[PDB]
């Protein structure tokens, strides 16, 4: 029924749009009016694009925007049935936010995090409602991508998973159940695949462009892995490999040294104008 999204950045704003799009009332919290407005402006822009394409009615864009209430006040979360944290990827911030909501929110509230790399279970333990703590891992762009990885911490109750599953379906998404482990499903498979491509390039086995063509034509992938690395962001790819190696303690997942070098140069991919390809 009523949802709070903590953080009005790229994912936060998209998650807010996704719920609001399906008739849910949405509180959207950030820490300065400027940041809130930036999120509302971004949603508004997305929704204009959709009206412009004839995909929705102008009245629908308005109905959706009116369902979203921006705020800088964390107490606005208190009567919400679901909170989705999409803040900065920093463990102490996660834990601080969840501990506080645990006190601010009514007992029934489910507390979810969109985190890619941090332990749901650890986050849960900072609260006295671990049974109600869960991961809800959306994919960019949140309004469009149907996949949600529903991450169960070891103490996440079946009741909590079931409600989030149903809520996920209710907003037009296709949820999958994942017991907490490093990289969940998608990143666990995909990022090492990008890291493997780096390895091939580093040893002069083939060129950036041949590696990518080989994967596109040979495995029927939409993008080649290096192109994909650039799209996701090489700093993100590296941080993910760092967590896989760190969490597993298995050198299997060691990020390649050439990857480290690209990142240290600021050659992060599309968003910096340069990565494995020049933009």
């Amino acid at each position: 029924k009523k949802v709070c999204v903590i953080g009005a950045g790229t994912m936060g704003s998209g998650i807010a749009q996704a719920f609001a799009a399906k008739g849910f009332e949405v509180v959207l919290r950030d820490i300065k009016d400027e940041f809130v407005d930036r999120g509302l402006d971004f949603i508004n822009k997305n929704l204009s694009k959709l009206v412009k394409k004839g995909k929705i009615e102008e009245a629908t864009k308005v109905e959706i925007l009116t369902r979203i209430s921006g705020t800088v006040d964390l107490n606005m979360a208190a009567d919400c049935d679901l909170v989705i944290e999409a803040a900065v990827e920093r463990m102490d911030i996660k834990k601080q936010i969840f501990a506080d909501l645990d006190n601010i929110c009514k007992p029934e509230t489910i507390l979810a995090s969109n985190t890619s790399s941090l332990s749901i279970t650890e986050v849960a333990s900072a609260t006295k409602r671990p049974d109600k703590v869960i991961g809800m891992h959306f994919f960019n762009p949140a309004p469009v991508m149907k996949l949600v990885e529903v991450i169960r911490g070891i103490a996440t109750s079946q009741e909590t998973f079931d409600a989030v599953k149903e809520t996920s379906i209710a907003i037009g998404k296709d949820p999958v159940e994942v017991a907490e482990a490093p990289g969940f499903v998608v990143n666990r498979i995909l990022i090492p695949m990008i890291n493997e491509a780096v390895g091939i390039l580093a040893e002069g086995i083939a060129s950036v462009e041949d590696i990518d063509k080989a994967m596109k034509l040979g495995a029927n992938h939409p993008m080649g892995p290096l192109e994909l690395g650039d799209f996701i962001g090489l700093d993100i790819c590296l941080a993910i490999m760092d967590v896989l190696y760190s969490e597993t303690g298995d050198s299997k997942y060691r990020p390649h040294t050439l990857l480290k070098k690209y990142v240290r140069a600021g050659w992060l991919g599309r968003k910096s104008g340069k990565g494995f390809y020049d933009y």
Copy 2:
């Protein structure tokens, strides 16, 4: 030019079709008439499907079939410009055949292997022609799939590479350059991905179908890794990991114990009615 394909199974016959179809004279060789004739039957069937599909006229079918001469006699390769060895077999006898071809063939002839598990360099060393020995890795089905991984043995000359590259383009393919290494590009990246999926299943992190769903929706792939494993054949997948682990000596590429158990059960995927899914 004129080309010889050695091996009249589905890959060999397919490759011969791809050349004949582009105006090249082709000698298809296998070890007895009944293998040769089966392969020509297979090709005939393939070209028959393409008339019904509307893509070519029956006349063209006939013309394509006239360019292909079946034989048991390896001496018919003597004046060929390119010889493509496609018969899956042991290193000991592949070496013989390349050595045999080295004596038989005119000095211009390039000797190519379709292998993906054996060393191109090692095979080349059984000939006095190592600068003219090269890998040409086609993808199933050979007539339609555009990718060719052109595999350079350490002695393969730039001349030999450039000729095979241009020949590849002449038959409608999109060649990539690959220095010989374990798994080339496609397998080196793709198979460990399937192996990774096995690992996630094995630790009860997610079900078979949620793993595949997550990869299809999350990474926009047309098949999930486990479903893909069943399609390739889990025996084939295991054998590839075996090669990667054996060649690298890096336990990063260790095949998962669970994959070994599926294969020892004869649960090979589609071809046996059962793998990670049952059919």
Copy 3:
């Protein structure tokens, strides 16, 4: 209920004895009279020792020996409800035995292996009743030791597992359910512990006596790890590590070089008069 034990060595004989002791009619099959009679005579001696010590009455011993019929003829397994193979572990042979038994025996017959190191699943694939093949792993001495690790191949049915579980209880054993994996439970944990001790010794960290004393007093174990290795047999300990490393592909389970050296010396422990200690 009627059981067949294949292999009149120490373990096979002990197994036959445990079954006979609990009311089961038992066929004991080996490849030659000499081995069969040696088996029966080992069981006689065990039972006579128990009489002498006053644990069983003479008439109990006589009844027990009556329930065991020695034979060299595998067709005597034909109507047994359970067959337990306890011959020496060579996959090619074990597969032959299991295939033969598959044709000889009635369809209800469950086929069990006492192997510690060969794949139950792979053995099962040699038969047309993979759902009736299973591991039953006994501990020396079988008449005395309570544990049975019941090893499910990936195709072993619930019904087959439930029947073996009940039978184990019926013979006064305490079965545990183990999905097939390298080392099952006990060896998977115990041998690497012995291997670890060897490493400590090899780096001069502590003496043989102090390593074993530390573990006895510190972990409340009845034998220290090196003693235990000597008791089990160092050749046996090394073969298990070899299997763990070979199946996992994880160098976590590499056997220590010092252990290899002891075994190559013939310094196997108690059975040779010398291992980590002198006997």
Copy 4:
């Protein structure tokens, strides 16, 4: 010849160690930084002695004699004339060094300086003193009054004389010492905790249940506890920390802690002490 010992850190382990010495005719000092800690340690010793009285293991008067040999304090200088000092305090290296450096200045030269640490380098601690030849590990097992094993840990500069002296003292207080050249996990932890970590791996992959793993080990290897219940008994946080040290020190992924063990610890499911680990309590 040692007859006066100072124990530093009045927790479970330090108080157990003070009691083991007090019970065997040493003059014992027990130091902590706050009287509250000291008093609590005394209460803990009082309590274990009372349980022995009540079991009929010892007379009440014996208990009163034992308690009299122990003098609590917060003044570090009370260690000055001790023949032996056993530090059993916080496991943080920089503070441990400071303690040992101060003891080095405070103590007569004959005084042997020991640590009960399981995780930190004796060699490294010794290097903060001018008496590295007289620094040593004396690793006790909980409960210290009952368990006979002591792992006597030699730093690379520990002298034969220092070891001999600690060896014969251990034998004098009724303990059974073993000699261990410093390395990660000494003997017991180095072998035992990886057994526990291995059980977690078996569990994680659905190979067998918690109860079946433990039964298999108890019956199959003739152990009194299974690895998973033993982890719960030791404390899964303690188990994870040790694995962490083994992996960190060796740099060998052979000793990587299982990811599932990490998840139990992160949940606060530490075993008996939290009412939940691999089993419910």
Copy 5:
């Protein structure tokens, strides 16, 4: 290149300064205070005096060389220099600061090089707006005599920046090699793991310290055995390099041996402490 600034008046810095002045180049030698600069200049004066005394150069040659070296504390004196060499061993945070400051101060042509092998040149270069002009130039002690320079290219280092540094290296009598930035470059990447391996052999009682060293000297014709070499380099240094190799690669192949850790922890660092694998 006419004018070079060397930052750091320690042994390494002063040595590099000397090598440049000896070959005709004008040099600015910079450090943090006058005492250090003067110490460095006295060190150089002494080296050159040794060369005069042994008959390698004439007194007037020594004087000429010394006059090409100007000493300072002020980093602004590097502004018109064509090459800057940051010699002092730094923390990453300070290094980045220094390079960022040089980037703002110097004329746009100036190439900014680092002698310091432990840190990523690519990472340092990202602290400036001239990453194309940031490079590694790794000398060997003593820098006036040792011919080898490992010229380390950051991933953004331009062909023009490398070519200039290669040419300058040859102009000062050195023998440069090209190295793409990677952990341990060439020399340390091969050499230090060899020492580490020796330690593993020692730890398992396979052979004694002396027999290990004898074996390598006589069997592989090495000038020093691995264990005495460890002592000469400094075992703390050796450990720190293995730490970097393991940390950067993430491969257990390069794990420092636990016995090496114990020697360092004891303060038994080798010659510099009077004791390592040998007693000095």
Copy 6:
């Protein structure tokens, strides 16, 4: 003292020479007359160089050859005091030879192997005189190279070791004591250095020439690792890395895939005219 060398190949002939130059009586055995004469020629030819460069007198050359008798009869080993096997690097054959020698030779005979790669302990176990079996690892060229790695099997006696140490000194060598382990000392350290260089090359970090120059100038080595590889032979280098990986079970010692590719090409180094460098052209 009488010595028997099994194998008149490069190493055996060299070893035989080294013993006869120091006054020992030598029996040199191979399986055909042709191979014996080949060995004796090779020795004669080496000694002729030592004369024609004034290193020894013509009379010394003759004395030396006189102390050597070629044979095809293994029974000529029977009364020798030391047998050195330098035949063929196959475990079955070493076992076979040593089993037979154990029966043929008098009880006092010490049985030594020149093997680089095979277990001394295992070879010794095919005899009933394991206390008398040992490794004597010579370096090419055996007559010149001073180092000998004396390899103790786990059963090799102190007596046997000291005898072989004394004999090693007596023939003007500098022996070192090595407890059996993969690669002994020299190869265990040296070959992975070469393997490491290969990895630097494979990743485009530096060229062949620059790698070797870096090592020569930077480490004061006479040869760089890649040219050293070519000199030793890349097949030999790969076979050693294979043994290290095989015996240790540790990926630390995995041979680089690039090395494997060079060897498969027949680019083995100097012996084939091409390895990391071009020699023949």
